[PDB]
Amino acid sequence: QISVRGLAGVENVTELKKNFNRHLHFTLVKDRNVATPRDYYFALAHTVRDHLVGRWIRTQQHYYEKDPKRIYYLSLEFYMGRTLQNTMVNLALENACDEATYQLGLDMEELEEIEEDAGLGNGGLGRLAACFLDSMATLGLAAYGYGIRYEFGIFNQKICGGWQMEEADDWLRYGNPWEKARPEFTLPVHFYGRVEHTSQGAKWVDTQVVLAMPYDTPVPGYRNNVVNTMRLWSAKAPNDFNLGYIQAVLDRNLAENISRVLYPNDNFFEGKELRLKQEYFVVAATLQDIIRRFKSSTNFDAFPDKVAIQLNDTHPSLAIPELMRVLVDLERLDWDKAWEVTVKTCAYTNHTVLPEALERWPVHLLETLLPRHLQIIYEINQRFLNRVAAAFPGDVDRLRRMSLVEEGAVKRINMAHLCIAGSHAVNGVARIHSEILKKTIFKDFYELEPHKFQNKTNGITPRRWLVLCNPGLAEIIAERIGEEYISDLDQLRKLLSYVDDEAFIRDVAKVKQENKLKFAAYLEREYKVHINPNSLFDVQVKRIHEYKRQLLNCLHVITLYNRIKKEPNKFVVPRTVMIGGKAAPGYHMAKMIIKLITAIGDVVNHDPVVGDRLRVIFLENYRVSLAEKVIPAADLSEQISTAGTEASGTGNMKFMLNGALTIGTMDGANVEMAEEAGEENFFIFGMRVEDVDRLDQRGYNAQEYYDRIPELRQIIEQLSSGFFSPKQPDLFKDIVNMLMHHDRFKVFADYEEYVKCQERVSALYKNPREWTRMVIRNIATSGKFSSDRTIAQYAREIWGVEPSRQRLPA
Amino acid sequence: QISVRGLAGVENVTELKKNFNRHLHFTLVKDRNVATPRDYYFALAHTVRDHLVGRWIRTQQHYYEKDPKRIYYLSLEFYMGRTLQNTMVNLALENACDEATYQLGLDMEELEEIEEDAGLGNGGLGRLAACFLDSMATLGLAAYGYGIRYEFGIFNQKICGGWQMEEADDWLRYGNPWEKARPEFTLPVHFYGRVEHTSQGAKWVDTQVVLAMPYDTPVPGYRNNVVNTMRLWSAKAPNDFNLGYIQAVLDRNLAENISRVLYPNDNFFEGKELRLKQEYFVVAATLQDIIRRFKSSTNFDAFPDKVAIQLNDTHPSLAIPELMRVLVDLERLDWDKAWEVTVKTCAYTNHTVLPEALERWPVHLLETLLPRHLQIIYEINQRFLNRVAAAFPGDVDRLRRMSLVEEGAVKRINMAHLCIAGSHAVNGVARIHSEILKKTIFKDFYELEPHKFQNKTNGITPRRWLVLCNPGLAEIIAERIGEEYISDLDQLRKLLSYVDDEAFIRDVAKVKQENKLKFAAYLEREYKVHINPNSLFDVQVKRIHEYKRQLLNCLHVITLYNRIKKEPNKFVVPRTVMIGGKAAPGYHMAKMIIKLITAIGDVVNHDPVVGDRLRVIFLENYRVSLAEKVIPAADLSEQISTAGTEASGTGNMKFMLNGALTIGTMDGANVEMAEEAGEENFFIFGMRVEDVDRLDQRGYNAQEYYDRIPELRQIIEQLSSGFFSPKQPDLFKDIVNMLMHHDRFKVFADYEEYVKCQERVSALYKNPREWTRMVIRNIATSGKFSSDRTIAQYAREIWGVEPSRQRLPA
Ligand SMILES: COc1ccc(C2=NO[C@@]3(C2)O[C@H](CO)[C@@H](O)[C@H](O)[C@H]3O)cc1
Ligand SMILES: COc1ccc(C2=NO[C@@]3(C2)O[C@H](CO)[C@@H](O)[C@H](O)[C@H]3O)cc1
């Protein structure tokens, strides 16, 4: 159909049809008479998978022959989403498969909807890892993603009576055609035990053993025939485990629980033993695999020349003392040499400055679970503090501030401090965030080792986040500037010469309208909800958190509603306000915010006076697959975190690429997005970081805003009195109390500027031509935010490797 | 190579080679450079599996079109063993695959050794189910085996310091290429809850739900293109199960534990809740599947015309009240009609008379777990006892004897009584056993309903137990009488005309010697144990149990040892005495017997005076795959249970088919084996059932035998004094005490006759020609013991269906 989706050659289509039929028969053991849509999906998935295998085998043998430096990306989260369409896109098979299935009497888009998301992440951090894997393969890097194969990913969200309910994400129920179990490469992981000091060093003895079984998933690069590997570990009990008899076999579950479930927390540290076990499990299995591959290329001097380990936040921080453990205790290297190797091998990316998100593990937990690692951490700390003391003599408070060990009620290990000490590079994820690191939380460390600190602004893959989810936009762009931009997003700048082109203005607006129509149809079909496709689609999709200020959005919605009720016969630009996202199950306030959103919708959506002028919808079960649907449909992207709290954001970049305008604070990557597009083409409002600092020094008094803003007072009185909960008048008392007395994120302080800015949004939307011209200026300057740019920077500035766009032989 | 293994055609070999290479590449994602023997096994398994699928699909569609009466074989145990060679044998692919792999530079027999046994059974009962499935497919019956997919089968046995150690049988670790998951046919199973009586009947409410997910395994018939199904259920938690959050997901294990592990008891009832859950789980899921298939052919009058349910012992006895529950509570049939349908549908096979093996479930367990079923059982009991009372007026003791409910300390339900009441046919598994049922334990029931009671003597499949495990013997037979005997074992009678044939005598003895050489080589390679292949191979392999009297064998071994020590320079026929079998983990005496056997070996095998004249070896980890190796190698089969205790035995039949002579009591099928071969061709000794009865009336006094048999006294004194355990003098005190004071199985009473009979065995072995002629007379008369004969009898006399040897189109 469309050019960017590749060729549908007679030979290819014929071969795909026969292999589809072969898999339906031999693999699925079905015939066309009893086969269901799900059977057809699997037949297609197996057919497409077959095209990966040759490339996968030859890529890995190529790395063995060439022996390049290997990049190991360690993460507790990989938010992959669906794999079928992505694989077709990267292999240039989309049009061919569309044709082949059409000739078989099937609709490929219907088949695509059957696949479960691989939801092995919470949101931004896990999705970043996924985009990074795509870019590393596209740039021809010898890269491996290492994580945990959770049996249960992020929970499925159901809304019942306006409240969030959780159910298990049983994503493996029907099988996973993309993974290949590798039980032959199973490795032991040790827990508990005790440390024994001998004539020849320390020994870790009397341990409990859990097996780590790897599953490999292919990661295809964009049309370069490179296929890299994501290796995820699954926990298995040894066969002699606890070996009355029946109970001993049943108790195997205790060991295997390590890989059972993803902790569902976004930007929050939960210091539970099971989580610590997960963190060591991935680190210990991965490091053994790395060392084995290195030895099968004695001389650990060349280790950092052949190995780079990237730590995705502090979650895999145990890699540092584990590497030291192996080099010192097992390989018999002297401490100083082992440390040199460790520092040159490891690098650390920080993803957040929120205090409650930082990992600080109780010493007593590490003492019991990992006694040798605690000893190594103590030794690292002593040698590090000796360096600090030499550099800043007599500065006793600096010593206590910089220590890896924190004293108090319970002694804790600060994992961020451990990571900085044991890495040759430390980076933040957006310019403003990286600067905040050097000025505030890591100031002492920056003063000691300034060369260590870097910035690497986040990005998103334009394969998934443009070509896959928005083929209509990809096509109209390709018509003007060709296809090269898909792996070189900076080429989008060429679209600036089309901002006054009448045909292009028309096509951009047409594609958006089509996306909005399709999404409005999706909502009626799957959720029986009705929306006006002619309204402004105002979208805030992201995890529910106080810092992200879904509450500020709520205040604006109620403001709009109240203004309509005050002057019903006055014209207003119609809006569909859509808010979606999951709350962590134990996060009370986040669950209350969801209830508030649905409660507002219950009032607003059924008021006859409002009509089709304002609709409030909560998007249930926000996940990667839903993002791919709603983002291309959006007109307005809400990026409204309190300045200094969103380290980068990546949803922001997705919206910019897909033709939505942004209303946002100068926070995270928003700053750089506005810099790229020009501030005139961005809807910027609210406090800057400096303004937040000034307010904190003064003391934030929410009452002041309540007293001086009549429209805000009305809303608070409505919430308190039970306007949005008539049967339960005091339902939202917790929300009001927080807003009035203990709001860490200063919702009221940005209210006036936000509402004012929203009026400017509505004004521009009244002028379709000028709206679209501003959209074109955003799309055209979105190039910097490709994860290809991000990964190229990591490669050159941290890993010491050169990216390549050269094809491998097919 | 050999004729019975089929053709190796140029086309077939070429196609097998290319499909092998295709699977290694696409399915396993390997190349010849990194592939291991295990990879090669899987490539072969997938290649052979492909040949099943067409036949499997067409067989099942054929049954849908023809709508024959369906046979449902319900069992908690299916002891399948390995599948690769069996599939090749039944598809006539063995020689072709041997050639194809040879041309690829691989040894197929090496590849076959990689496959794990499917050990979903304890021994005889589970193996009978497996042979039955093979015969039902070979006889073209529309038959389905239904059971549980245990994650862990019968434990692997390790011998450490002469003691049995258990480890988990993680048989699914590397995957199972033979099964096809069918998550789309998942069914709910209900537990606990309460009964609510309404206007329109009873309702079972507030239940806990566990999902039953089916896995299908193909069961190929012998060269008839029929492929039947074994459907095994796996337990899955519903996604809202227990839905803080993390613990709720972890607690899913509680539901899924139902299908985790096989109870490892042979002929013993363990009344645990988990076992009851397993029994209902298989019954509830299976019955829903049966009813669905019946409705997709309202009128339940024709149900028994289209459905037969065979209960493999009382383990699936809950099928009776479950069927009543569905028909009465859900389908709204009147009780009398539902009962008529149930009785005509169900039939019950009893497999044991040992009191400790009979299922008697505490009422309090059924009350809590299955409250509606208990109510139905009470109603069945009342109506049944009303029938008994009408037939035998005033016989109050008969009423209490026949009741399904047993009174006492704890009230129990007698499941055997339930089965007899609710089945139209009840059978024992050998003539002597079926007679014992009518004369003793079920006498009252036989008097009420004589027409119900039948015999169906057990059998074994000649495919696995001759062609597969002993191709050399199969070939020399085929050379004389052709190939038809493989599916018509009665044709072996034609070998009687060759008993004086000098060439045949030579060939039979040659095949045995070759088997003995191969097995002696297997022992050195895998266990570093050395044996004389010129010695008489004296073998007792079966589960360890007091009733099977491994202890009687031990007494003979020590007798032989003592006689050698008394007269060292006197010639004796050299023997290798081999004993193998697993003990149930909680069966103390059985574990003590294993230790005794190894302790005897420790003394006997290292005595320089004995030399190579006597060796005692314990065969570790006895299982189906080991049976296939040792049985063809055996000279003497030990079948020495106390008369009246072994219901049938099936190991006995395996040895007879493979050219071993039998030393045995007149117990189980031994009686019929001797009848078929002639008593002159069997080594019969010991008490008959009548003699055991006489001794019981008198009172068994072991001291009497001790006092009057000097050779027996010597052995007991050796055991007691610590001759076989010098470092632990009193190690075998429990064994001596049991033998002397509480031996239920009268070991001493058969000692003299046993030793005498063993002397006659040695005498005949000294004459190779006459030994072999007697062997030929055994093989020639083994035809009755084919499971094809057994299944044909079930078909005609119980199920009301006609077997067919007609081919389906290929
Ligand atoms: C479980 O602990 C955490 C889970 C998630 C996270 C984060 N999720 O999103 C964050 C940080 O990382 C993204 C990728 O760099 C950034 O774009 C977000 O701004 C940041 O909040 C931090 C800790
Ligand atoms: C767990 O409960 C039981 C397990 C096994 C058994 C049996 N195993 O072997 C038995 C009975 O059945 C075989 C098949 O009919 C017979 O050949 C054996 O003689 C009998 O002991 C009985 C109860």
UniProtKB/Swiss-Prot annotation, chains A, B:
Residue numbers carrying N6-(pyridoxal phosphate)lysine: K654
Entry GO CC: skeletal muscle myofibril
Gene3D superfamilies recorded: Glycogen Phosphorylase B
PTM comment: Phosphorylation of Ser-3 converts phosphorylase B (unphosphorylated) to phosphorylase A.
Gene Ontology biological-process entries: glycogen catabolic process
Catalyses which reaction(s): [(1->4)-alpha-D-glucosyl](n) + phosphate = [(1->4)-alpha-D-glucosyl](n-1) + alpha-D-glucose 1-phosphate
Essential cofactor(s): pyridoxal 5'-phosphate
Modified residues (Phosphotyrosine): Y192, Y215, Y446
EC number: 2.4.1.1
Site positions for Can be labeled by an AMP analog: Y144
Keywords: Acetylation, Allosteric enzyme, Carbohydrate metabolism, Glycogen metabolism, Glycosyltransferase, Nucleotide-binding, Phosphoprotein, Pyridoxal phosphate, Transferase
Positions bearing the site annotation: Involved in the association of subunits: C97, C131
Residues noted as binding AMP in the record, renumbered to the chain: D31, Y64, R292, R293, F294, K295, S296, S297
InterPro entries named in the record: Glycg_phsphrylas, Glyco_trans_35, Pyridoxal_P_attach_site
Positions carrying Phosphoserine: S3, S403, S487, S720, S721
Sample GO molecular function, one term: nucleotide binding
Record flagged with keyword Acetylation: yes
Superkingdom as given in the UniProt entry: Eukaryota
Recorded family membership: Belongs to the glycogen phosphorylase family.
The protein's role, per its UniProt record: Allosteric enzyme that catalyzes the rate-limiting step in glycogen catabolism, the phosphorolytic cleavage of glycogen to produce glucose-1-phosphate, and plays a central role in maintaining cellular and organismal glucose homeostasis.
Subunit structure, interactors included: Homodimer. Homotetramer; to form the enzymatically active phosphorylase A.
Descriptive protein name: Glycogen phosphorylase, muscle form
Naturally occurring in which organism (per UniProt): Oryctolagus cuniculus
